[PDB]
Amino acid sequence: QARSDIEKLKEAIRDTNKAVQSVQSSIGNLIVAIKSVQDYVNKE
Amino acid sequence: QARSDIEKLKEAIRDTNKAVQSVQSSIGNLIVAIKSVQDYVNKE
Amino acid sequence: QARSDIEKLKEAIRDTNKAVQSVQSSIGNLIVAIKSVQDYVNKE
Amino acid sequence: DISIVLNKIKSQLEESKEWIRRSNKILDSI
Amino acid sequence: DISIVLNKIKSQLEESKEWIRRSNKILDSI
Amino acid sequence: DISIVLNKIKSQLEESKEWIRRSNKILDSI
């Protein structure tokens, strides 16, 4: 059904968006990790 | 409308793709950041 | 055609998902890179 | 030097989050 | 300190991979 | 050691950009 498939496509994109959001959170923490090493190198 | 929803799905995927492209640019700069710390550790 | 467009949307999301999977693999290796620098700083 | 690079990443991350917000709002209207 | 941060990234990466698996399974059913 | 890891990331990033290019081209044809 075109209506069922349209809803399936919507939910698939929703899940892809959630995957991107998780990647975004990971990148925010990678920044923290890089800063930490650089700050550990400067403070000791 | 199935035609309106098809266009909505298209634009939603377009925006998801732009989000991924921004993440890709971020990853390129994370490489630069990691190299910098490693190069700062080697040069001083 | 609504059927042709539904299939096009499906394949577009499939390709976006493959792009996210490549980004996920990159993030896994960025972790390795950060650990390496931190482990190189601790071991020498 | 590295501070500028990290600020770019933050800005690019902010843009990415906004594009997802727009995608989700579009999905809500379907 | 940094070890905890890297573990968070691993967990968030695992969640992301699972969301893509679900998206692809949905696509397979179309 | 680290140089090889960073080269892998570059290659995986290139692949990701190509998959988005293909997705966008498909969208253009709708």
**D9 contacts A14? CB cut-off 8 A:** no
Dist CA D20 CA E8 (whole Å): 22
| Token pair listed for A30 | 């990678």
Note whether C42 contacts E: Cβ–Cβ < 8 A: no
The domain segmentation of chain C, as residue ranges, is 1-44
Enclosing H/E stretch for C26: helix C2-43
Nearest to C13 among E13, E16, E23 (CB): E23
Question: CA B4, A22, E28: angle at the middle one, nearest 5?
Answer: 50
| Token pair listed for B12 | 């939603």
Number of residues written out for chain B: 44
Chain D, nearest residue to B26 by Cα: D9
Enclosing H/E stretch for D20: helix D2-28
Residue with tokens 């732009």: B18
Backbone angles phi, psi at A30, to 5 degrees: -60, -35
Resolution in A: 1.5
Sign of CA dihedral A10, E19, F12, A28: positive
Reported as half-sphere exposure (CB side, CA atoms, 13 A), residue D8 has a value of 16
- Resolved by: X-ray
Note whether E4 contacts A: Cβ–Cβ < 8 A: no
- Listed in sequence order, the DSSP H helices in chain E are 2-28
Nearest to C20 among A5, A23, A30 (CB): A23
